[PDB]
């Protein structure tokens, strides 16, 4: 199965700063990576699909970039409601797999 590594596991940042979450795939997967936000006690919520595509309802703050094996979720100007766990997910090859998670800390 495709291994998705997310390191660092925790990310500390000051309010209004730009933050970047990393996702690395164990093999090349074009742009078939999707990003989810999960707040404390909430269900996951899709933020970005196919590595860079916006979802409606998601703040413009959030963007994605990357292809092949290296992927980045970015937040321009972090704020409090962004405190969450962040997961990447691949749909290039069966079975779909998740990364292990990066926690965002302010």
């Amino acid at each position: 199965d495709i291994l998705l590594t997310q390191s660092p596991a925790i990310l500390s940042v000051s309010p209004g700063e730009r933050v970047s979450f990393s996702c690395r795939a164990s093999q090349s997967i074009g742009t078939d990576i999707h990003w989810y936000q999960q707040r404390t006690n909430g269900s996951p919520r899709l933020l970005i699909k196919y590595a860079s595509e916006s979802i409606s309802g998601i703040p413009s703050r959030f963007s994605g970039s990357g292809s092949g094996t290296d992927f980045t979720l970015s937040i321009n100007s972090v704020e409090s409601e962004d405190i969450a766990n962040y997961y990447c997910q691949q749909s290039n090859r069966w079975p779909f797999t998740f990364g292990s998670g990066t926690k965002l800390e302010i």
Binding site: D1, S91, N92, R93, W94, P95
Partner: protein, 103 residues
């Protein structure tokens, strides 16, 4: 009207249906096989087009028994249908040449 053009029209509709059903069935066949890439619908439709035209880039291909049977039906239908267009064109040209000759 003329049989060759009826058959061409019919060939084209059938091929469109084979592409669409092939996409749906390839995903069905291929999910559950570790390593399979032919597993979402939009790229499956692309894959079936490039298989029917017999272009086959190698960006996508089935790895299961049923996926591969699906693939074969798609090939045979693309080759057959395009062959039928060529046949219909040859009938058209032959009939017009008989005329131009006065036969």
């Amino acid at each position: 009207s003329a049989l060759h053009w009826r058959a061409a029209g019919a060939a084209t509709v059938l091929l469109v249906i084979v592409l669409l059903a092939g996409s749906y069935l390839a995903v069905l066949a291929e999910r559950g096989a570790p390593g399979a890439q032919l597993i979402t619908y939009p790229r499956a439709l692309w894959w079936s087009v490039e298989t029917a035209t017999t272009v086959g880039y190698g960006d996508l291909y089935p790895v299961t028994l049923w996926g591969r049977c699906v693939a074969v039906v798609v090939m045979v239908a693309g080759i057959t249908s395009f062959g039928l267009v060529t046949a219909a064109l040859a009938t058209w040209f032959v009939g017009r040449e008989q005329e131009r000759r006065g036969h």
